[PDB]
C-alpha cells in the first residue's frame, strides 16, 4: 500500500499515516487514522500524545506588532496514545511494526474550512504534530517533534446542479445561462449572452469576467474579488436586436501569476498548485464559522453609451482514482 512516514530530526519518534489526504463530506469527515512509533526506551519516563492544529495565518513575515502573532487555531484535538477500536489500516500497522506501536485517531467535526491558501503564508493549513511530554503542557523543542503537514480538501459531488440563470432588466432584458453547474478545474466555461435591446440607447461593448470570491472572515466579512479571466468583446446591438453568442472562457494560472490575493489549493511545500476549489457548506446551517470560503461567480456587463448579472458555479476537482500525490509529478 506504500504508507507515508515522516521521521523526526531526532533519531526516533516517527509517524505513520496511510494517506496524506482527508476528504470533508457534507455529513462527516474521515478519521485521521495512523500509528505513532517510538522505541521502548526514552518513553517510560514521559507520556506520548499527538496533536492536530487547524492553523490559520492571516499576515505576512509573521510580524508580532502589538502581540499579534497573525495566527489562529480553529480545531485542536489531543489524543493520548499511551496505553490506559481500530480500523483495517490501523491493525495492519500494529502487526507489522510490532508490539510497540501506538494507534492515534482524531475526529474532525463538520462545518470546518478546507485547506486553502492565497497566492503571495496566508491561508488555512492543517498540521499533525507528534511529541512526547509527561506534563502534556510543557514547551517542546522543534527537533524532538514531527512537523507532518496534512491537508483537507473537498471534491465535486456526483449529483449535478441546475443551470444558473439571471434576468436583471434595466430601463435590456439580459438573460445569461451557463452550460452546467459542475465545472472541473482547467475546463472551459460557456455562458450565453442572449439579450434583448429595446431602448434608443446603444451598447458599446460586452465585458465578461469570472471573479473568485475569497470570503475570508476573521473579524468582519470580506468580499475580495479577483478577475481571474477577462473576455472583453467588441460586439454591440442596435434598438430591437440581439447578440446571442456562446462565448468561451477558461480560468487558469499562466496569466494570473502577477495577481495578488488569488486563492489557491493547500500547498504542503513551496510547490505551486491550481486555483482554490469551491467550498461546500451545509444548507441553512452555514454561518460565520471562521476560516476562508471560496466561491466563483461569472459576470456579464453591458457598456451602454450598465446591466450586470451574476451566475454562481462550482469549480472543483473530481474524485481521485487511486491517490493524489499532492506534488509536481514531473518535478525538477
Amino acid at each position, epitope marked *: 500500500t506504500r504508507v507515508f512516514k515522516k521521521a523526526s530530526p531526532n533519531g526516533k519518534l516517527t509517524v505513520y499515516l496511510g494517506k496524506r489526504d482527508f476528504v470533508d463530506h457534507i455529513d462527516l469527515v474521515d478519521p485521521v487514522d495512523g500509528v505513532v512509533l517510538v522505541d521502548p526506551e526514552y518513553l517510560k519516563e514521559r507520556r506520548v500524545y499527538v496533536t492536530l492544529t487547524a492553523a490559520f495565518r492571516y499576515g505576512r513575515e509573521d510580524l508580532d506588532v502589538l502581540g499579534l502573532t497573525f495566527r489562529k487555531d480553529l480545531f485542536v484535538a489531543n489524543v493520548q496514545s499511551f496505553p490506559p477500536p481500530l480500523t483495517r489500516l490501523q491493525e495492519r500497522l500494529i502487526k507489522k511494526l510490532g508490539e510497540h506501536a501506538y494507534p492515534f485517531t482524531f475526529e474532525i467535526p463538520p462545518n470546518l474550512p478546507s485547506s486553502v491558501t492565497l497566492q503571495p503564508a496566508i491561508g488555512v493549513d492543517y498540521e499533525v504534530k507528534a511529541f512526547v511530554a509527561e506534563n502534556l503542557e510543557e514547551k517542546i523543542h522543534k527537533r524532538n517533534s514531527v512537523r507532518l503537514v496534512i491537508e483537507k480538501v473537498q471534491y465535486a459531488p456526483e449529483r449535478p446542479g441546475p443551470q444558473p440563470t439571471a434576468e436583471t432588466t434595466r430601463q435590456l432584458h439580459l438573460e445569461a445561462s451557463l452550460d452546467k453547474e459542475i465545472y472541473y478545474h*482547467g475546463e*472551459p466555461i460557456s455562458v450565453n449572452v442572449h439579450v434583448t435591446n429595446n431602448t434608443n440607447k446603444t451598447v458599446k461593448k460586452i465585458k465578461i469576467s469570472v471573479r473568485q470570491y475569497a470570503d475570508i472572515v476573521l473579524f468582519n466579512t470580506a468580499q475580495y474579488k479577483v478577475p481571474v479571466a477577462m473576455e472583453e468583446a467588441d460586439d454591440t446591438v442596435a434598438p430591437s436586436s440581439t447578440f446571442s453568442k456562446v462565448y468561451t472562457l*477558461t480560468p487558469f494560472l*499562466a*496569466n494570473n501569476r502577477e495577481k495578488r490575493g488569488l486563492a489557491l489549493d493547500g500547498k504542503l511545500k513551496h510547490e505551486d498548485t491550481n486555483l482554490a476549489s469551491s467550498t461546500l457548506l451545509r444548507e441553512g446551517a452555514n454561518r460565520e464559522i471562521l476560516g476562508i470560503i471560496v466561491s466563483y461567480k461569472v459576470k456579464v456587463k453591458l457598456v451602454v453609451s450598465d446591466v450586470a448579472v451574476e451566475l454562481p458555479f462550482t469549480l472543483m476537482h473530481p474524485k481521485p*482514482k*487511486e491517490e493524489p*500525490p499532492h506534488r509536481e*509529478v*514531473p518535478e525538477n
Partner: single-chain antibody
Amino acid sequence: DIQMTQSPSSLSASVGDRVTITCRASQSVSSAVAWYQQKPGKAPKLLIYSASSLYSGVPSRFSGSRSGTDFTLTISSLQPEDFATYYCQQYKYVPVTFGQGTKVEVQLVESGGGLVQPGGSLRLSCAASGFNVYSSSIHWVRQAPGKGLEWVASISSYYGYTYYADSVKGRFTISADTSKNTAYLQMNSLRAEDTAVYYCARSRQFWYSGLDYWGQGTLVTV
C-alpha cells in the same frame, strides 16, 4: 539522471503461459511507473499508470507490483494479440526515460515531416481534438528506427511551463495554440542523429498519470 533498464531483452513463450518482465530503476523512484505496449508499426498503448492500478480498457490479466525498485509486469495468458514490445517509464522527474524494450515472441493526428538537409528547419502540427489544452499536458517523444523511445519536450499551458531535453535544448521550441487546440513543434539546426519517428502524446495536466493517448507517426529523415 535516471536510467531505466529491463532484465529480459528478448522473451520467447507460447500461448497460455505466465511470463514475468523485470524492469529495475537506477534510483529510488516512487510508484510513479508506467507500462506501455507498442505493436510493430503502431503507437504505444498504456497498460498500467501507477505500477499497481489497472487502466480502463486493458484486460484484467495484466498486473503490476513493486518492491524497493523492482517494478514488474505479469501476464496471466498470452493470447495471439499480445506479442509486442513493452516499455517501462518513470515519470517522477522531468527527464523521463523509457525502458530498453522487451521483445515477446479523443484522436491526435500530426502533419508535416519530410527529407530536410542538415541545418534546416521543419515544423510539426499536432492537430488535437476531443480535449482541452489547459486541462491536459502535451509531450513530444521521438523513437529512432528500431531503438527505444526518447523524450524530447513538453508543455503545460495551465502553468505556462515548458521543459526541453538536454540534447534538444535551445535548438527545439514548443508552442500550442489555445484557439485552434493544436500543438506545434519547430526544429532548428537538424543534426544527423535526429532521424526518428516523432509522437505527440497527451497526459492529464492535473495529477499526471502517464501518456494516455499517443500520435500516429511523422518520421523525419535528414
